[model samples]
Every structure is written in C-alpha cells, then in structure tokens.
Target: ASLAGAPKYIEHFSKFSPSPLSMKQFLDFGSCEKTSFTFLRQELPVRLANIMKEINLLPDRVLSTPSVQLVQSWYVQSLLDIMEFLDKDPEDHRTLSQFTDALVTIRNRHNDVVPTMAQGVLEYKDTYGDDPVSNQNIQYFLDRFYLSRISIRMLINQHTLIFDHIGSIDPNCNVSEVVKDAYDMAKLLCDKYYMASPDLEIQEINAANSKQPIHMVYVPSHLYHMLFELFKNAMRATVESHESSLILPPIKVMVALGEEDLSIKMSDRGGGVPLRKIERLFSYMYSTGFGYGLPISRLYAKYFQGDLQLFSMEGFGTDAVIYLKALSTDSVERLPV
Candidate 1:
C-alpha cells in the first residue's frame, strides 16, 4: 500500500484512542537490529501459530477467577495486539496505535501479576495442594500461566522486528555511527523531559589491524533503540545524582570492536543501583516506571549471542555494556536459552 494509505487507515481508527502506554510498551523493540526482513519473517509464522493455541485456551481461564481474570486480561489484550499485527500490513499505521495501547495494558497488568499470581498460588495450596488430583490440576494451570506469559513477551518482541524491517529504507547499519547518533538522540530527549543535563562523549576504539571504523551489516533501527535506552539511563543517573544547582559532567561511551562481538560501555557518575535491587531493575514489575527498556534491550542483545550487562559501584556510578555478535551468513535469530 502507498504511504498515503497509512494515515487514512489510522484516521478511521482514531475514534478509539489507544493508550500510548500500551502502544509504546515494547516500542523499543521497533528499534531492534535485524539482519534482514527475511530474518524476522522466518520466525513470525511459527510464533504466531503457537500464540493462537494459547489465545484459544485463555478465555475460559480468564473468566473463571478474579486473579486469572486480571492477569489474563493483559495477556488477552497483548495476544489481541499480536493478532492485530498479523492481520494488518505493517504499512498500516494502526499497527503502531495497537502496540501503544498494548504497552499501557501490559504495564498496568505487570503491576498486578506478581501479587495476583502469588495469591492464586497460595489459594491453590490451601484448597487443593493436599489432594493428588486437585494438585495435578493446579500444576496444569501454573504451567499454562508461565507459557502464556512467555508467549506474550516474545510476541511483543517479534512484532517489533517485523515493524522495524517493514519501515526501513536501508537496513545495513554502522555500529560506530549508530552509537554516536543514539547518544545524541537519547541525551536530547533526557534533557528535555527528565532535566537530565549532562555532557555526552562517544568514541570508537580503532582495531590494531585496521585504520577505519568497523562497520557491521545489521539493522540500524535496533542499534539506535538499544543505545537510546542505555544512554538515557546513564544520563538520568548522572543528572539526578548531582545537585540541581551544580552543572552535570560528562557521561562516556567507549566502543570497541571485538573479534567475535561489538562491545559498547555506557558509563555514568550517578549513584549505582544497590546490590539488592540490581536483579529487580530488569524486572517488569519492579516499579511503575519500569517500562520494557532494560529487559528488551537485553533481549535484542541476546538475539545474536550478544549480552547486556550492568556494573555498579554502590555510591559511585554504573556501567552498562551492550554486546552484539559480528555478522555471519549462517547466523539466525532465535530465542535465548
């Protein structure tokens, strides 16, 4: 369809205001790097097929109990959002609105899930934990719940790959350039919204063997999305740690090209995450502000044997390292084990 067709379709659906929270829930996924549209397309049919079976089984459980209803409402809504992507052309702007609404629904649902699941589990033990047949039934429900949640998260991530691939004019990206651009973009946004006034410095380390910056054949959007999140967090930390009366200093990004992977470390002077809260920082339910940034960033990293790691010095600062595997024709994106 023509680009003009997008706004017309988007206008037709304007009566229903999809919450930005839901729409942007996995919005960063839209930035995830992809090797090609074919890379994303190969995963779509099978993943969506698995999603349909879960969608079919969820309705009864969704309506049966209150806790399940609350948790499943978000799951159902997300599944529906996935269905929307499958049914519509990526060129259709409604795909964007649908995901915006999904973020809102899922974020709200995240708040309720941990408590609701705990309550349900406790209730199950009280009522049926002692009975062999009843306990078995409880086990089945638990298994279903776990599978349902994982399906939702994966579907959300996969949809981003599809959207990113469809919207791109040029998919091949330079990591060094992408890093510099993402730093500038992220810093601009953080300063505007969060009052995170900080200096940004980005540099690429040259290889002992090469005189030029190493360029990777990968999706640029994904690289931008990951950098934006890492830079934003680092900037926010530095800005917040300093006295409002004081001018903030620089947040540094040191990029290195490895034989097997590209590694970029975002370092900040902001007070680091406490030893206790580091794990929870990646958790979807840790705080209301916990949008799908770190976890999804890590997902994008791991999609290609890369990883996202954070190192914090209790009172001093944090360093977030994002790694991406060097391109290989045989490399295929798959779920991390």
Candidate 2:
C-alpha cells in the first residue's frame, strides 16, 4: 500500500510514535557483537513473534521491512550491548532488566508505529483515544488488550531479572543460575500464556503463582531456538483459548554435560505434544495443519543442530525438551546431517 493509503488502513496507533531511523545510523550501530548480540540474533524473533500474535497480527504482517529492520538494529546495537557480558564470559553481564526494558519498548513501539489491533476495540482508546467508554465491550477489551499486554509485560520484566544473574554475570559466574535463566526464559518463551491462564478450565484459575526455571544441557543452538518456538506457540495458543494472566512455571532442564554428548532432560507445566504429531514435528509444510508457526520454528531449531523432543499427557501438562551436544572444533566445521 502507498504511504498515503497507510493511515486510512492503519488500525489503532497514535500519532506520537517517533520517526524512522536513518539507514546510516541504524547500520553503523546495529551489527552483531558477542554477548547480547548472539542471543538477540538467536532468540529475539521468538519474543517478537509472541507479541505480534498477541496483538492479532500474522507474523508477516507485523514483521514488515522497516519494522523488522528496526528490530534488528535495536537487537544488534543497543540490546546486544546490554547483553554483552552474557556473550564474553556468559557471566559479568549487568542487569538483564535493561534487556527486558528494551524488549518492552520494542514491543510497544511496533504496536504504536504499526499496530495490528482491531480498529474499534477498547485498546483503541489506549492508542488513539477515539471514543473511550466504560461498558461490557470496554471490559472485554480491558481483559483482552490491557490485561494481555500486562501479562506479557510481566514475563518480559521477569526475564530481565532472571537473565541478570544467570548468564550475564562476569568473573565468577554461576553455572546454576545460567542454566536456570536459560530454562526459565525458554519456558516462558514456550508456555507462559497457557501456564498463565490454563486452557482446560471452564472458568478462570488463580494464576498469580510463579514457577521455577528449567535447567538442562543440549545443543545450545537447537535448544535455544526450540524454546523460542515454544514461546511463540504459547502466545498463539493464548489468544485461541481466550485466557489471560501470563508468567508460567519454569522448565526444569537437567543435562549431563559431556565431551562427545550432552544428554538433556526437560519438563514444563503445559501438556506435552500429542503422539500424532511425533513424526511430523520436525518436518516443514507437514503441519497437523494448525498454521504457520511450528514449521518455521522447527526449521529454526534444525538450523542450530537441534530438534524438539516431547512427552505429553492429554489432560495434564507436557514435558518438552531439546537435546544438543557440543561439536568438536573439527565437527563444528561440518553441517548437521
């Protein structure tokens, strides 16, 4: 659509969003670095995808060129710097509060700049302030839009707290903490929404309690992005089930870090995958036909030499884990089979 046609089709953002960044400034600052850069490169798309789905946008709809570029710029430049410590020593990083803060900003800014919300919903008042009112419609949106955003924001905020001590501390790093954050981040990224509001209940459940983070060892690439995919799925499932209250129990990841192989065991609070999905979970375009997300995430995990592992219970929660073993320097030179 033409720029002139944009406002007409635009949904609920206000006029206060800042202007676009210049190509020069963006590129100069947005290149990859060690700590935060690598994780941002690996894990942020999972985060962004969650926020996008929550706001009723297709992944493609929200991640348009300019918007995506802005995300990359921020992730590569500013966010990476904040996570730099995590890169160097996997320790020595300062507060991940900054990382979560940045994520919230990115999430909100995108919504503000090019929101994908419904035009006449109550969230519009939060954005455009066109015709504010207090009624059932407004109340529905209060829970739908406002509460949902708040739920997501909670996870984002806690992620900052978790990562600060886990993987970013310098000098004397805590391996337990690192594993914990990775597990927690992975869990939330994978299942916060359902864990927050649980889909099976006929009515609401008290969901304010927090769970422990899961810890494990696996191929970092596969393991990391698999969690990302799960996180993406959680957000998608939340809207489908019409539940709220985010912040799920942490994943428990147990791994025996080995020279040639890392065996990882993981468990989450969500119902695990179905037996019907086992074979095709790793295949692209071979979905149970739910939709677009799983295939993309499957491919993403594969790229990092990882795949999703699952043991699910029908009415209870599921235990999903990814196993990744570190490659020898020589083995690393070859691609995964």
Candidate 3:
C-alpha cells in the first residue's frame, strides 16, 4: 500500500508491504476486486458479484460474506500477482494476452485454485463420489489440468519475456511441441496411475475396428490429463466391481493410423462410462467424477483443430479416439530461434 512500508498505504492495496511493484502486482491480482469504499461510494451489489468471480472461487449461500467494501477489498484478483513478485526483474514475455491464456491454463489445473478436487464433485447436490479413488482421481485430474494451464502460461511468459513476440518466432509456429509434451505427460500419467492404483488388470488395447485419419495438432497436450483421468476412473470402477486382478501390466498405447491422421485409442478393459451419460460423455463442464473427459478434450478436438471421440460401452469397456491435425508450418519447415 505504502511503497514498501512508506508512511501511508497505497490507495488500492492491502495494509501489508507498500512497494510499487508489489502494489502493481496486487492491483493486477485484485484487478477484479472492489472495496467497501468503492461500494459505499457507488452503493451497488456488484461488490459481492465481483468478489465471487474475481477471487477464482466463490462463496456459498450460507457462508457468503456480507457486501462490505472492507471485505471486498481483501479478495478478488487473478493469481497473476505472483508473476512479477517471483521474477528477478521486470521482464516482458509474449503478449499480455498470451501470458494470460497460459496463466488461466495453469491456474485451472492448480489444486490451490479449487484445491479440493479430492473431496469429490457435487453437481446440483447429487453427491457423486465417495470411494477413495473417486476422490483421488478427481483431485488428480484437477491438478493435471491446473498444471497444463500453468505450464502453458510459463512457456508463453518465458517466450514473451525472452523474445517479446510469439508470432515472430512462430512464423513456422506450431504447437506440436505442446502435443509432444502432452503425450509425454500422458505416458507419465498413465504410468503414474498404474503405480498408484491397487487395482488394474491386464492393460490391453482393444483392437480398433477401423483406421481413420484423426487429424489435429497439439490436441492431446491441451487435454492430456483428462484422457488419463477417465481411463484411471475406469480402472477404479473395475476395482469397485471386484475384478480379480488389480494390476495392468505392459500398459498399451494403441495407435490406429490413416493417411490424414490416426486414431490414438487408449482402450481399457476396465469398467466403462455410465450408460446414461454415454451421449453426454464429452459434455463441457460435466463432472461425472473429475469431469466426463469429453467437453474440454472436445474443445481442443473441435475448436483448436483436433477431435476426441469416446466409445464407452458399459459392462464391456471404453476406448478414446483422438484426431489430430498432422500437418503444420512448424512441422513442414524449421525456423530461427
């Protein structure tokens, strides 16, 4: 508030340190926050509304704080505040927009943001998960997504900080590296899940009936953990059903290739998706225990030049097919650093 504990507190900051950079970061963090003073002078309900959205987590009806500027002032800000503080010196990376895109990606995956995915999801008060896995799996996916977002932010921030123009270096720009990283991540996650799971029988890839070119790029990286989460959940369901063996050895990553692209299917013999929601398998924001795995994946598949399909048959098994764009400028040509 006061520029590094000066005689007075900065007008738009906490009573803590008053450094200008700190104030800047605080303002950036509280970019969404509005105080009692602002509310009192303005006299509106937006204080509460702003507090709920800006803080990254909203309060509940029973425990929600009162509409006071004093309270409002304390909260409401994006997590980007830490960037400047953590940096050794002021540096610019990528455009502010690009950095934010990456920031949101990481923040979403960060457990600290929601911080309680392990607690299981409550959709409109239905009470979805209770089993040990249901909780753990949920948390894992959340953390994965959070990491995805953060890693992206970090990369863009680094790029922007270093080059100051992502577009320039991106003349042959392709997010293929991102996809490669994502696949690497998926492999690690699968292996990690295997290590963590007490129940996983024979990790076998269901033979695909058809070979279609699933074209899109960087699709998997953007949503790598979501896929792993589903397969992991299936394994959990298998455990719940009392499958004899709880260990899948030689975990398989079966790829079905075509001219345009190929279907990357992770077929698990574990229990399948709920019968009722097969249609809604990839529905966005649908959390059928750590998310249905469809929506966000589909977003990449559909919006960002990729495709993710799920053929999950109950009692039998589940197979996820992802279509990625095979060709890109980066893939075709090498560019300067």
Candidate 4:
C-alpha cells in the first residue's frame, strides 16, 4: 500500500510529454523484435506517471469522492509496480517475461475504470448541484482524463499482445465485417433491455473498384467499439419512437470507402433530437441513460484522427456519420499533453 517513490516519479515523469504514434509507426516498432520492448520499457512509465499527475490536478472536491479515490489508488499502485520492474535489467530474458506479466496484471486491474469514473462523476454531481461553472470544469477534466486512459491502455495492450506474438494491428481490417459484428452485439443488448430491436441493413460501396470490399490497416477492436455505441444509440431511439407502432422500421447503414477516407452513415427513423440539444449530446454530463456512450465513442473515433457527428431533423429521423482516416499514416494517436 505504500507508494514509496510515487511523488518523485510523478514529478520526474511530468517533465516529459507523451509521444503520439501513428498506425504505421506502431507497426514499424513491432517489426523489430527487441526494439519494441526496449521502447516500451522506457516509455510506459513516463506516460503512466504523467496521467497520474493529471488525476492529482483534479479539484479537491471531485477527487475526494470514493470512486475517484479508488481510481487514483489503482494508478499509484500500477505506476509503482512498473517502476519497480524497470529498476531491474530488462536485457535479461527472465526480466522481460516478468515485465509482460506485470503489464497483463495492470491491464486486468484497470478494466472497471470506465464505470468507476462514471460513478464518481455522478457522486460529484449529487454532492454539488448543477452549477454551470462547476459542470464545465468537471467536463473538461473528464474529457482529458478518459482520453489519456485510452492511450495508456492501448500502449499496454499493444505491448503485451506483441510479447505474446498475437497481432495487435490488422493489416487488412474488413470494415463491413466489423460493422456487422458491432450491430449484432448492440442488437443483443437492445433486445435484452426493450424486449425488441429493429432490424439492421448494411451496404458497402467501394469508390475505387465497385466490386471490391472496403479494408483498412487499423485496430479492428477500436473500430468495433465506435460502431457498437452508434448502433446502440440508433437502436434505442428507433424502438422508443415507434414503440406504439405494430412494426418497427429497420435501421439502415451505409459504408463507403472514399479516395481519402472511410465514411459510415447510420440512419434511424427515430424522432430526431431538438437542434438546441444537439451539442449537449456529446457532453459527459448529459445523459438519458449512462451518459458515457456517445462521449466515449467520440473519443475513440478522434483518438485515431477520425470523427463522429450527428445530424437530426426534428420529428423525422437522425443520421450519425463516422469518418475515419483511410491511410495508416494519417491515423495518428491524439494523446493528451
């Protein structure tokens, strides 16, 4: 429980900023056997400690909440463990194996972070009513915090998977297949909740060659997560708007591979959101449900220099468009500074 060198390590690591990596750079690193491990051994601690410092920068009132305190403790413990592992000579085969094991343990320990942070935010809201200034401060902090969390996890998982010789980056990730997988998972959740889910239809268009499928060099899981959230939101809206109707309309998805980017449009006949409330839909503080889905999904999209946008016509339907970088070089990590 004693974080002996935590303060000093945090101060030391704070001096260095995080280095954002593109998909191509990541693949290049993994191509070398020893170079990747060496880079991670030196890099992960700095990133981890920098994130810890950011958590400490939070306002005292927000940090005092139980859930936030628990989250902070996890970071402190993980940082200490990594620092200890780094103290030994990584040149040894045994030491390298131990380091990978430690990373897996850290990753497993941090799995509940999303829900815990959400709970912490709710606790803060309950303690302090919705004052405009306070809400803005907390929202800003949460955005940076969650984005940093995603970056760290990606670094850790990528290293661990590479160590195990399991591929982390897909050279030819199929866009249509990932979309369908996300839709099926989202539909399962929708059915469990509302006892019904609208059908899903997906069409793929290849701009270069009409007969070919759309494929990109990227992480399939990241694409899947973004699509899953969009599908869930669209499904929820469709079912709620037409609950009284005997039959629900199908949700339509269009996937197009442009010359420079891959774009997806998900359309739902669900009643459109009011224009006034459109911006608030992306805020972490606004939610008819858990409130983390849209904002987190946007972060995932933007992490790779991609984007998620919403356009709605009141009383008609909603269209959500996700734009992604088609080339690996353009898809760089947007790490928090």
Candidate 5:
C-alpha cells in the first residue's frame, strides 16, 4: 500500500500562528474561569496541529526515523483527542471536567518527549554519521519543537491546575527559596551518579540588609526548571573539573533585583568551555551529557522574554547569567509561528 500523507487538520492548522500571552494577562483569567477553559479549547488544538505539521516538515531522512515518527504519532494522536472537545461547550461543567481529565492524560504522555527526541538525534547520527548540514537543520528544528512543546504544556497545566484548585501561579514567588530547591534537587542527582557534589552558596545583593524576601510575579515551576538545569550543569562541571581534589569550591549564585529585571549569576569552577565550542553550547547536537539541558533551559528563559547567557574564561571557570523581566506585564510569551 502507498504511504499515508499528512493529516488534514495538520495542513489546515499549520497556517495559523499560536497566540501569545503575557504573564499579567494569563493571571487576569482569575483561576478556573469558564472563559479560560473556552479559550484553551479553541487555542490548544491549533497549537498541537501546528506542531504536528512542523514534525512532518522535517527532512525526509529525519521524519522517516522510528523515534521521530513515534514522536509525531504521539502528537497526532493527542491533537485528535483534544479536537474532540473543540466543539463541546466549555461552559458546561461536565464537558470542562472531562476535557481536564483528557488534558492531564495528554500531559503525562509527553513526559518522555525530550529523551525520545534526544534518542532520535542519536539514531540519526548513527545512521547518517555527522553531516554538519543535516545536523544543523535538525538542531534548529528541535529548538522550535521543544519550545512549542513547553508552551503547550504550560497552557494545559495552568488551566488544569487552576481548574482543580491546586494553585497554578504564585503571586509572589520567592527567588531564594526556589533557587535553593533547585540546588538541592540538582545536588541529589549529582551525588547519586557521581558520588560527590559541590555545595551551593547563594548571596543576595542590592537589598541593603532588608529582611524582606525577594519576590517576582511568575510561575515558580518555570524558574525551578531553568535553575535546575543550570545547577546540574554547574555541579557536574565542578565535580568533573575538581576530580582528585579533596575539596571542591562551592558553586556561587548571586541574585540581584534591579530597576527593570531580576538577575541571577551562577558561577562554577568547572573548566570553562573553550572559545570555539561556545557557539555550539546551545545547539541540540552538542553536549557532553544528555545535551538538552542548556538549550531547553535557554528556551524556558526566553519563553517569558527573559534571557540566559554563558560567559566562560577558558582555563578558569564559567558564569551563567539569567535575566528575567521583574514585572509580570513585561513577561510575555514568545510563541512559535
């Protein structure tokens, strides 16, 4: 039999762009409002369909790979499942509840997407060797693919969490607390694998000894994800660099609230990345480990108009700086086309 072609919905929805939302605008829905559910019902399928179309647009060599095809099939199936609710009245509590249940299932299905995509890249490399042209194309596609995935999940989670009254957004997320939690989480992983992990030192500047907790109006989970990636990288680099040394320097984190943005600088004495390799730091194809940490973390930062940067001093250490829009109004979603 002849191979099947792209789905009709993919072709149709791919023409539209996903609507972006600002942090303040997202919060304005006021938690569990019928309008939010209605908006999600209309918006999500389009986003999912567009992403499926994106997967189909990949180079034939990639799209034909088993792992990539699996990923695409998952999206296709999810889009179909979600489309079932597009015609249902979201204002009806029964319909809303069922939609939420289906969304939770869809969300869980995507838990392995990152690792699966990483495997696809490896399979591609194995079968075709390292063709820089193909690698670069795949890398570029993965960046947008993962970012869109994050956006979709965020939309689904916010709605579901709020609908369930489980609390989605934190009006005043404490910077230090989140940082410490991320550090602890990263340390646990590092210690388990490497049997050793460096301590984290957090210092707050510009507070002038004020006892108040530094807070930002943002999703704490997003901040935690970004910090966790940075921390894991820093800890891994530090441990590997200081191998054979009895004592490892504590990783340093400096948090500063400025006039416009909140800045976080994480410094580690991990033999810094070479100048030539710096360009590929954010590339999905380049990684000493699983390879998605920096790239995905950067996307998480950029999602809300924030930025993540790395400054490395070749034989000394590296500094990863994260700048976030302190005001919710300035923190808007950067959606994919």
Candidate 6:
C-alpha cells in the first residue's frame, strides 16, 4: 500500500486556471460531491438494508414466492453494486477513459435501480396489499430513495458546470452563439422525436438599460442543456396538441435579460396537464420522456443560482421559465448594442 498526496489527483484541474473565484467554484463542486459520496456510503445502504429487513418479514408463503423474492433481490443487489462503486474514489488511479467508463456504468446501473424500485412498489402492493405498516415502510423507502438519487444527480450537475464555466471565463465566449447552438440541437431533437417542426422565434428582452447580446458571461453547455430540454418538451407538447393539421402551432421561446439574471421562456399549445400531474412534472419519477430529465435540468438551473419554473394554462398550454444569473462584467452595450 502507498500513502497518498496531492497534485496527482488534482493535476487535470489546473487547466481551469487557478484563481480565487475558480477555486471557489471547484471547491463548491467538491462540497456537493462529498455529500453525494456520503449518501452512497452511509444512508443509501442503510435504506437498502431496511427494505430487505421489511421484505423478509413477510410470511413464508410470500417470502418463498419466486417473483416476490426476485424483486426483493434485484433491489438489494442493485444497492450493493452502487455501494461497491462508491466505496472508493472514482477518479483515483484511472485514466480519463477509465473514469468516464466507470461513470457510464454507474449511471446506467443507478438508473436501473430507480425503475426497479418503482416496479418493486407494484410487486409489494400486489403481494402484501396496502396495510398501514406497508404504506409507512413504502414511504420511508421512497424518502431515502429519492434523496440519494437527488444528491447524486446534483453532483452530476456540478460536474458539468466546471467545463462550461471555464469556457465562459474566456473574454470572447459569445452568449448569443451559445443560445444559437442550443436552439439548433433542440430543433434537431424535436424533429427526430416529435416529428414536429414548430418554428423558433427569437427575441431579446433587455432589463438592463444597456442593449443587445445580453452580453454577460455564461457557461454555454449549461445554457445549452437547459434550452434543449425545455425546447424538446415544449416542441413535443405543441406537436402533440395538433392532430392531422397541415400546419402545427409553433412553439415560442423568449430570451430576456434581467437586472440580475438572464431568462428564457417557452410556451406550447399542447393540451395542458392537470394541476395534480403538473405538480409531479419535476419529480425524479415523473416525465413523458426520460423521468429524470426535468428534475436534472432544474437542478442545473438552480446550481448556478437560478431557477426553472412551469406554468400551465389549463386546457390550453404550458409555459416554462429558465432563469440563470448573468455573469458579472464591466462592458456596456445598449438596446442596439
């Protein structure tokens, strides 16, 4: 065994350019990552054990049932697999490819855990029937489950920001160019998935008395991911809302500059969701597409001290607001600037 020291694990981080501000962001990411690692190390495993204990409490007939037993083992093993991955430093002693490969494995496996947990609930209801004890146990299981998932997902969010934040720190990164690239990607996704070509209308809403490009600094990837997700959802909704029409209603996206933040909004004519379902739209398990997309997207928005919000026009459409803080700068450009 060898004793550990610095510069080895921290070498790649130097490319980000050492600065008080940059180091602050990097340290913040480490702080978030530590929480996620701790959850996997301690709390998540405890929850898995608790669930196993509850499952074993069933009568012999129920316990011996092959289908029931299989579901139980599936989640138990899934938790163990995750624990093994989180058991040590993910980036330690690994090449870049190795680190990414490990991440891919962890992501796929952890994602499997969520859907299986959902399935396990179904199995429990069918076999045990919902008694107060079962319900309480189920709620406890979910509380821990979602908390662990949310913690890991936020860590992923912070990981993404480091790259983009580095780019945005460069004086030449154009905010408009980033938005344009994001729009292109979102449009491509909409065409492929929704088969809907809702036109994109772009405008600048300036809150600063100063003018265009909203020229504050920002990470392109963060904005791109947020816009793409929002557009994909809005485009799908609008396309689905129209049936057999020669022309579909166009999805509208608005970009604005606020005194303190940059904002974008999307509106669609898709039949709106019921208020109850609307409430779940941001949950880890709720989505018309990937269940985690909205939740993760919202996490990204908030990671940078901004927020994402949804408003539904009941029966008519939905509107999404994506807000992120504009980077601080000294240059002045006006309405036409």
RMSD per candidate (Å) reads 11.9, 16.6, 13.5, 2.2, 3.1, 11.1
lDDT of candidate 5 at residue 101, scale 0 to 100: 90
Query: Which residue pairs in candidate 5 collide?
Result: none
lDDT of 3 by residue, 1-337 (tens): 1124311212223222211111122223232211311211121112222222333332242124232222223222222222232322223333344444543443344323332322224431243334545445434444333333333333333333332222112222233233344445444554465444332222222233243322332323344544555455545544444446655432234544444553456566566767677754442224443433444555434432446777777776677676544443212211000
Candidate 2: tens digits of C-alpha lDDT, residues 87-121: 33423233344444566565555343212232233
lDDT preference between candidates 1 and 5, better one: 5
Alpha-carbon deviation at 236 in model 2, angstroms: 7.7
| Candidate 4: segments with Cα more than 4 A from true spot | 192-195, 288-292
Candidate 4 structure lDDT: 0.83
Q: What is the alpha-carbon RMSD of candidate 1 to the true structure?
A: 11.9
Model 4, residue 3: what's the lDDT? 80
lDDT of 4 by residue, 1-337 (tens): 2487678877887788888999878887766545666777667777877778888888788778888889988988887777776567656788788888888998999999988888876776677766668668867887788888888888887887877722567889998899899988888889899999999898988989899988998788888878888888888899999978988899999999988889999999999898898888887666514224888888888888999999999998899999999998899998877
> For each candidate, what is the lDDT?
0.56, 0.37, 0.37, 0.83, 0.82, 0.55
Q: After superposition, how far is residue 278 of candidate 5 from its true place, in Å?
A: 2.5
The candidate scoring highest on TM-score is 4
| Local distance difference test, candidate 6 | 0.55
Looking at candidate 2, the ten consecutive residues that score lowest on lDDT are 328-337
Among the numbered candidates, top lDDT falls to 4
The lowest-lDDT stretch of 10 consecutive residues in candidate 5 is 1-10
C-alpha lDDT of residue 74 in model 2: 38
User: What tens-digit string does per-residue lDDT give for candidate 1 at 172-273?
Assistant: 456777877877787677768876668778778756545676666554665676788888788878877886547787888887876776778888889888
Q: Number of clashes in every candidate structure? A: 16, 24, 39, 0, 0, 3
How many residue pairs of model 3 clash at the backbone? 39
C-alpha lDDT (0 to 100) for residue 83 of candidate 1: 41
- Superior candidate under TM-score, 1 versus 2: 1
Per-residue lDDT of model 6, residues 22-116, tens digit only: 32343443434444344334433444444445555666755675555565555455444444544466345343334334444445555555555
Better of 3 and 6 by lDDT: 6
